[PDB]
From a paper:
The 3C-like protease (3CLpro) is an essential enzyme for the replication of SARS-CoV-2 and other coronaviruses and thus is a target for coronavirus drug discovery. The multidomain protein nsp3 contains a papain-like protease (PLpro) domain and cleaves the peptide bonds to release nsp1, nsp2, and nsp3.3,4 3CLpro cleaves peptide bonds to release nsp4 to nsp16.3 After releasing itself from pp1a or pp1ab, 3CLpro forms a homodimer with increased protease activity. 3CLpro is a cysteine protease with its catalytic dyad consists of His41 and Cys145.5,6 Most reported inhibitors targeting SARS-CoV-2 3CLpro are covalent compounds derived from peptidic scaffolds that have an electrophile to react with the catalytic cysteine (Cys145).6−19 One such covalent inhibitor, PF-07321332 (Nirmatrelvir), has been approved for the treatment of COVID-19 patients. Here, we report the development of specific, noncovalent inhibitors of 3CLpro.
The 3CLpro of MERS-CoV shares only 50% sequence identity with SARS-CoV-2 3CLpro. Even so, WU-04 inhibited MERS-CoV 3CLpro with an IC50 of about 1 μM. The concentrations of MERS-CoV 3CLpro and the fluorogenic substrate used in the assay were 500 nM and 200 μM, respectively, which were higher than those used in the SARS-CoV-2 and SARS-CoV 3CLpro assays, because MERS-CoV 3CLpro is a weakly associated dimer in contrast to SARS-CoV-2 3CLpro and SARS-CoV 3CLpro, and thus, a higher concentration is required to facilitate the dimerization. The higher concentrations of the MERS-CoV 3CLpro and its substrate inflated the IC50 value of WU-04 against this 3CLpro. Consistent with WU-04 being an effective inhibitor of MERS-CoV 3CLpro, its binding affinity (Kd) to MERS-CoV 3CLpro was about 32 nM. The crystal structure of the MERS-CoV 3CLpro/WU-04 complex was also determined using molecular replacement and refined to 2.98 Å resolution. The binding mode of WU-04 in this structure was very similar to that in the structure of the SARS-CoV-2 3CLpro/WU-04 complex. The anti-MERS-CoV activity of WU-04 was confirmed in Calu-3 cells and in Vero E6 cells, giving the EC50 values of around 53 nM and 609 nM, respectively. Alignment of the 3CLpro sequence of SARS-CoV-2 with those of SARS-CoV, MERS-CoV, and the other four human coronaviruses shows that most key residues in direct contact with WU-04 are conserved; in addition, most other residues within 5 Å of WU-04 in the SARS-CoV-2 3CLpro structure are also conserved. We conclude that WU-04 is a pan-inhibitor of coronavirus 3CLpro.
Residue numbers in the entry:
A (entry chain B), B (entry chain A): 1 to 304
The structure:
Amino acid sequence: SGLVKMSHPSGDVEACMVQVTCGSMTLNGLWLDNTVWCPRHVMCPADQLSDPNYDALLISMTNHSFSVQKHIGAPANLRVVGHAMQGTLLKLTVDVANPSTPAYTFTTVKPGAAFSVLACYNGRPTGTFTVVMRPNYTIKGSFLCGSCGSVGYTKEGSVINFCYMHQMELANGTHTGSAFDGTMYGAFMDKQVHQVQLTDKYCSVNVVAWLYAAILNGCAWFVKPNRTSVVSFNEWALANQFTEFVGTQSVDMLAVKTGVAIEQLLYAIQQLYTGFQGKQILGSTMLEDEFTPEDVNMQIMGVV
Amino acid sequence: SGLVKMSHPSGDVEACMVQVTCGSMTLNGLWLDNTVWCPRHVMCPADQLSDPNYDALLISMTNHSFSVQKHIGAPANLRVVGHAMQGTLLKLTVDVANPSTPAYTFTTVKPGAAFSVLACYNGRPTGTFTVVMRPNYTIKGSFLCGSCGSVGYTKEGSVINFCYMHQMELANGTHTGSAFDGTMYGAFMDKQVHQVQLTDKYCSVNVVAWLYAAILNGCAWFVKPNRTSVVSFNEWALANQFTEFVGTQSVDMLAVKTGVAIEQLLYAIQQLYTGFQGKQILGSTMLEDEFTPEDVNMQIMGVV
Ligand SMILES: CNC(=O)c1cc(Br)cc([N+](=O)[O-])c1N[C@@H]1CCCC[C@@H]1NC(=O)c1cncc2ccccc12
Ligand SMILES: CNC(=O)c1cc(Br)cc([N+](=O)[O-])c1N[C@@H]1CCCC[C@@H]1NC(=O)c1cncc2ccccc12
């Protein structure tokens, strides 16, 4: 029993972190097979940060303009045999294939999904935590200067899903990054300019999962027989800054084990959005959308 | 910037997890050099879980009663060449030394301290999170059946401090375990009998660290010129379920860089235990004691 912010064990990914240095700019990079991914603004000379010409910056570069160093495990310098650009990322071809490359994927997560983040500095991991892709395509992490290139991932089975590479802090505690296809979440730009965010919203499915968690941990004062259809809640959501609810088989698993219908918790959410009246839900006085249905499933009933 | 619950990268400790089997019971064990630490109640069947004779169960034991097996990376069975009991733990000697043994120590943590927990099942790591040793000598983790033997740790430099081995769940979301000297935190007993806990308290030093974090994120509406001595706050604390405050340099480093005195934040705590006046502090309506001064230093200023 118990619900915490839980991240995936990071050894798989610790073995893939390196330091990327270009000119006078250093950051972190992900070393998979014969490739090292890193943010492309490592090439930007710090003063072209307001109007960077990444095409010109790339053609300007040679393969020795980049230095890749591995500080964890067995250290080595890796000779860079190729440099390429993909969206907002640099893909550097190296002469040695990473012997610790795990089975991996590059799939872009949508808002509401969760992934474990491994924060790194100078190619050295410092901490790990779990975040959620906000509806405005940001995350609420903890990053200092030089942490870009740190990677966010999940793992189902033996396969690691690499979904995030840190790039920018927009406001206090607000951050963004890339998918490993090169596209930046929310179409933000890698340039120190004015960047407006969309409005943040509560992730409906995650609140439902969190209420199911509270029930399975002996906290169910908020449950009454009343119900509210999914259409009834999505229309309510379009006016009160909530995401459109979409049922999934994990949410349905939670509903089956609690004997509490999704519609009951949607009604409960409608009632709790005003205020908890001084009561607590799993030690919280607000609705919590930091927990996905899969996360609660694995934490409460386990994936054996 | 930003403050999250951050855990230490776990590869160090993942490389030390094994499965320990004694009869029909299977839990996790920590493999350091030629020794495997595990909870001793792996020896006791449901038959004697209400009044166990651990002294006799050990003299009853042979080296063939125990099976140690390694599931991650390269699987293997390890022969048990010796069995011993130390407090509430079993030390089983094996013929093979763990080749990935890191530099480690065994220290018993005090209330208010935080450590990273690696949750394991059948010797396989599943998740990692951060907990705090509560004033009643429990932790608020996430453990299901088979979680025993999972370990909580910290890291200084190259040295891992092993502080916790999980053993029991007392109530929903409430857990405890033993230190690697063999003693169980809070003197709980490894017998499936009802054990009432002492009263939980707010850990004052950690709330002070969290307020310092808030100030350093441009959030300091709660700061008044008013002061409250540590002696007034401790007298107030013993009557309002707070721990008695004790300063450290870590708090003092925070105090000088914020230009805000500890006593000011103690006054703020006295005022905030009532209610936050509809305000938010780093996005919550509760006081947060999950963050230690060292944690705040490392996350905000990078002083580890
Ligand atoms: C205004 N801070 C922005 O991060 C930023 C904003 C915009 Br708008 C555009 C970019 N951009 O173009 O990459 C930004 N990144 C900076 C530019 C060059 C390379 C990376 C830089 N950022 C960090 O080093 C960094 C990462 N995480 C947390 C931090 C906390 C404090 C200080 C720095 C960071
Ligand atoms: C549930 N009850 C107790 O855990 C318990 C309670 C007391 Br009082 C004493 C012991 N004791 O003496 O070991 C206990 N451990 C059980 C006894 C035999 C071996 C381990 C057993 N526990 C787990 O498997 C376990 C661990 N963590 C979280 C869990 C969540 C749900 C279910 C089980 C767990």
